[PDB]
Structure formats: C-alpha cells, structure tokens
Design a protein around this ligand. Structure first.
Ligand SMILES: Nc1ncnc2c1ncn2[C@@H]1O[C@H](COP(=O)(O)OP(=O)(O)OP(=O)(O)O)[C@@H](O)[C@H]1O
Ligand SMILES: [Ca+2]
Ligand SMILES: [Ca+2]
Ligand SMILES: [Ca+2]
Lengths: 358, 144
C-alpha cells in the first residue's frame, strides 16, 4: 500500500494512502549533542541543539532531510521502503533541481518501487472537493496564495509571503516580554507556540477589539507555565495574528494576506476571477486562528467589486488537508499508471520528474 | 488505461459514473437522474457540433452527505478525464440544491434525490501527534 509523506518547515505529516488522516505528526528537526530525529530530538532537547532541514517550505539540508525520511519510514511508519510506492509533497515554485534531488534520493537511497511529487496547495484544493479556486496555505515557515484552474496552479499568479507560524510565535514572545515576562531558551519558544495555539484569535475589527481590551478585562485569559507560574494574556491574544493582515507589526513592508489574495486573483484572467472569489480555501496550521475566516470574508469583500460572491472555506481538518488530498490521489484506481516507477527512473534519470509530475 | 476512460466521450450522449471506494463505476443507464445524496458522481455530456467535433461538459455532483474521499475523488477524476480529452472539457462543480440550469436540463423528466449511498473508502485512524512540550527540567538544562 502506498505511503503519503507531507514534509513541512515545522512538522512532518506521514501515513498510508487510503487512511482519513496521517498516522504520525512530528517536528521536522535533527538534534545533536550521535543524532536524534523528530519527537525524540524534541523530548531530549535539554542536551541537544536543533537544525531544521526545511526553511520556508524548501529543503536546504539534504543530509538531514535523509535522516528525517529514514525516521519516517523506519521509526514512525515502521515499513520497509522498498515495498511501498511513496507520494511526497512540495512547495509551489520549488526549484527544479530540488525536485530532481528528491526523486534521486527516493530511488537510490531508499530503493522505493515508485514515487510521485505533488504541489501542497493543489492537494488541499482537491481535499475540499474542488478543481478551481484560490488556496491560502500558511504553515510554520511560509505562506502562499495559489490560484488554481481546472486542476492546475497558475504559476504567474502565485504569491509567496515569508510571514508564517514561526514569525507569529516570535512576535507573541516579543510582546509578552513587553508585558513583563521572560522566555530566554529555545525550549521556551515551544511554550509560547503553545500559548499562541491555545489562546490567540483574529479580531473581526482590530481597532474596536483594542478598545474593548482597554475598557474591560473580559478578553484576558490565564496560561500555566511548566514551572507552575500562571501568566495573563490580554490584547496580545489578537495582536499576534493581526500581523497576518498588518505585516508592519514586525517591520515588513509586505501587503497582508487579504491584499495578496486580491493581488493574486487580479493577476488571473478576468473570466475566472468570479470562480476564484467564490472558492477561497484555507489550509495549514497558521490558518487555524478562531475568527480568521470571518475576517478574510470581510477584508476581501472590501477589496472586490460589490456584486462579487465571496466565500471562504476553512475546513476543521485543515492542518492535515494537504496530507488528506495526497491520501485520496494515491488511492485512486486511475493513479496506478501515474507513478514514476523504478524502471522509468533507471532509463530516464531524475529529470523524469518534470514530465510525470506537474 | 482505465477501462471507463477508454469509453468516455466517444459518441454524443450522457455518461454517468459514481465514485465507489476510490474508483469510477458506471451508473446503470435505467437509474440516470436518481442521485444518492450520500454520494458523489461524475457526468460527461458529449454534444455533436456541426463541424464534426465533439463538445464536452464535465460536471461533478456532490451529495449533501457524501464523504470527503468521495468529493475529493470526484474532483480529481474530473481533472484526469478532462486531461484525457486533451483539456477540451469545461468543468462544473454541482452541489445538491444549487445545480446549474444546464446540468438540470440533462434530465428530461427532472433529476431526483434519494437518501443513502455507498460507504466511504477511507480507513479511520487515530493520528499520533508526537511533539511534546518541554518540562521545567528541560528548560533548566538549556539555561546552563
Ligand atoms: N490552533 C492553531 N492556531 C494557530 N496556529 C496554529 C494552530 N495549530 C497549529 N498552528 C501553527 O501552525 C504551524 C504548523 O502548521 P503546518 O503543519 O501546516 O506547517 P508546516 O507544513 O510545517 O510549515 P510550512 O507549510 O510553512 O512549510 C505552526 O507554526 C503552529 O504553531
Ligand atoms: Ca506545509
Ligand atoms: Ca457515500
Ligand atoms: Ca478543460
């Protein structure tokens, strides 16, 4: 049975084609004092330093990436890779040389019988039961707007924003520090990440919410640190993710995610824009904030012509939408002849990936 | 190579398939227009143009209770069929209760809904998230 591995900046999501979710989700890290990977690197981080092989969605350390994949096959999925066709995912606009490298490592290092690479955002659109739409995919490392028509991304219209989950975590840490707290270790970043995931939300109207926080204590929440100290989080709860709409909060001159969605749509043929506005699909961990869909609906409505039908689709399972799309694709009776086989690789070499995998 | 792709769009008419456990299975001709609301279907309307060419409209119809594997598969099968037809099909998403007038016009005595359908192809799994938060002791270790 086929495997599905969705490799991200922050987390690996791995499993078997045909399952409704990944079997294992673990951090994309290698830690050294001879090395540990994933969940065990995380749990032993007291005595290790960590490296992340994927930066802003792109693999930049191939030797550590091989360790991550070994850990996925042998430690998490507990399979012999030579027995299983393997579907991997990639970022939009992934460099051509990277696609060839992934292919080469799968066949020559792990001896897979067959392999395929798919674009993450496109898998997410398929998981939502659509062939046309615009995906907002935001993880730990990178954010993209990917417009898609009749199954295929429109490359000229893709927007990439280097403002994602890790930047949000660092900013929450900055402003919580301003409130009087202190988070001096890399280990404590993981705590601030947890606060972010449990207590942050996107305000429908940012300036009104600030006024509420200033005139009442009703937005304040408590959070218990590992040493038992209970701290208070106020307007930081919604100031943190407001950064997605106002990147000037962390010094970036970029447009916020509402404006890049609009800019992306405006780069496409006027005849498909209506279908794009009606099919905005959110995927990835950083789209998980309560309130984000309602905020996006409001902001896009404000930018678009006033007769446009606007719809935001934010599935509850969207942390795993990419993975689920791959599970579905890999399971289809029609997909059997679409894999790159080991024989095809032996005859053609890694460049085969550009002809078999859009 | 899939047998149903070989049959798709060869002559003018209507063809309907139902998604069944990650496969595209033809609907019996006498049941055309009776859609299970627990399922997802793919419909190809082939029209003979006066210039001798065939015109193709591909609709994927999503029942209100169809499972995620079914609606995802309907969408993907639609892309693959369109590609097999040299991109020449126009794709239409049809949701129960909101179907297009041209889709509705394919069914001369009116399309009808019935409850039920084929079971999901997904196996249900319990994801293990292995990303533990640091203890007091781990944080103290990094300080030193
Ligand atoms: N409930 C939540 N609210 C806000 N952020 C969340 C939530 N859940 C997870 N996140 C954040 O989502 C990110 C991980 O998401 P995801 O697995 O989609 O990213 P990734 O694939 O590893 O990274 P990328 O796509 O950028 O390469 C982390 O920054 C995490 O803190
Ligand atoms: Ca990702
Ligand atoms: Ca069904
Ligand atoms: Ca087409």
């Amino acid at each position: 049975t086929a495997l599905v591995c969705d490799n991200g900046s922050g987390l690996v999501k791995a499993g078997f084609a045909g399952d409704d979710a990944p079997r294992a989700v673990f951090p994309s890290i290698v830690g050294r004092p001879d090395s540990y990977v994933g969940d065990e690197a995380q749990s032993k981080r007291g005595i290790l330093t960590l490296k992340y092989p994927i930066e802003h969605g792109i693999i930049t350390n191939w030797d550590d990436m091989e360790k991550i994949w070994h850990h996925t096959f042998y430690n998490e999925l507990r399979v012999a890779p030579e027995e299983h066709p393997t579907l991997l995912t990639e970022a939009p606009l992934n460099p051509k040389a990277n696609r060839e490298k992934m292919t080469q490592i799968m066949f020559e290092t792990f001896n897979v019988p067959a392999m395929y690479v798919a674009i993450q955002a496109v898998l997410s659109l398929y998981a939502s039961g659509r062939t046309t739409g615009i995906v907002l995919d935001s993880g730990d490392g990178v954010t993209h707007n990917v417009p898609i028509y009749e199954g295929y991304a429109l490359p000229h219209a893709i927007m990439r924003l280097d403002l994602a989950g890790r930047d949000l975590t660092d900013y929450l840490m900055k402003i919580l520090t301003e409130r009087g707290y202190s988070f001096v270790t890399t280990a404590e970043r993981e705590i601030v990440r947890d606060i972010k995931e449990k207590l942050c939300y996107v305000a429908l109207d940012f300036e009104n919410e600030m006024a509420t926080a200033a005139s009442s204590s009703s937005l304040e929440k408590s959070y218990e640190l590992p040493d038992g100290q209970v701290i208070t989080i106020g307007n930081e709860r919604f100031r943190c993710p407001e950064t997605l709409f106002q990147p000037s909060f962390i010094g970036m001159e970029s447009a916020g995610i509402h404006e890049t969605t609009y800019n992306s749509i405006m780069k496409c043929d006027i005849d498909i824009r209506k279908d794009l506005y009606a099919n905005n699909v959110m995927s990835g961990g950083t789209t998980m904030y309560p309130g984000i869909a309602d905020r996006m609906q409001k902001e896009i409505t404000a930018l678009a012509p006033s007769t446009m039908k606007i719809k935001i689709i934010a599935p509850p399972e969207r942390k795993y939408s990419v993975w689920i799309g791959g599970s579905i694709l890999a399971s289809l009776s029609t997909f059997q002849q679409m894999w790159i086989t080991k024989q095809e690789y032996d005859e053609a070499g890694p460049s085969i990936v550009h002809r078999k995998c859009f | 190579e899939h047998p149903e792709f070989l049959k798709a769009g060869k002559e003018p008419g209507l063809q309907i398939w139902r998604v069944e456990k990650f496969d595209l299975v033809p609907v019996p001709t006498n049941l055309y227009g009776d859609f299970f609301t627990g399922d997802a279907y793919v419909i190809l309307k082939t029209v003979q143009l006066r210039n001798g060419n065939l015109q193709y409209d591909l609709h994927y119809w999503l029942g209100n209770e169809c499972s995620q594997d079914e609606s995802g598969a309907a969408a993907i099968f639609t892309v693959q069929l369109d590609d097999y037809l040299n991109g020449r099909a126009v794709q239409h998403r049809e949701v129960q209760g909101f179907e297009s007038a041209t889709f509705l016009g394919y069914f001369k005595s009116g399309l009808k809904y019935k409850k039920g359908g084929v079971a999901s192809g997904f196996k249900h799994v319990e994801t293990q998230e292995k990303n533990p938060l640091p203890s007091k002791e781990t944080i103290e270790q990094e300080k030193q």
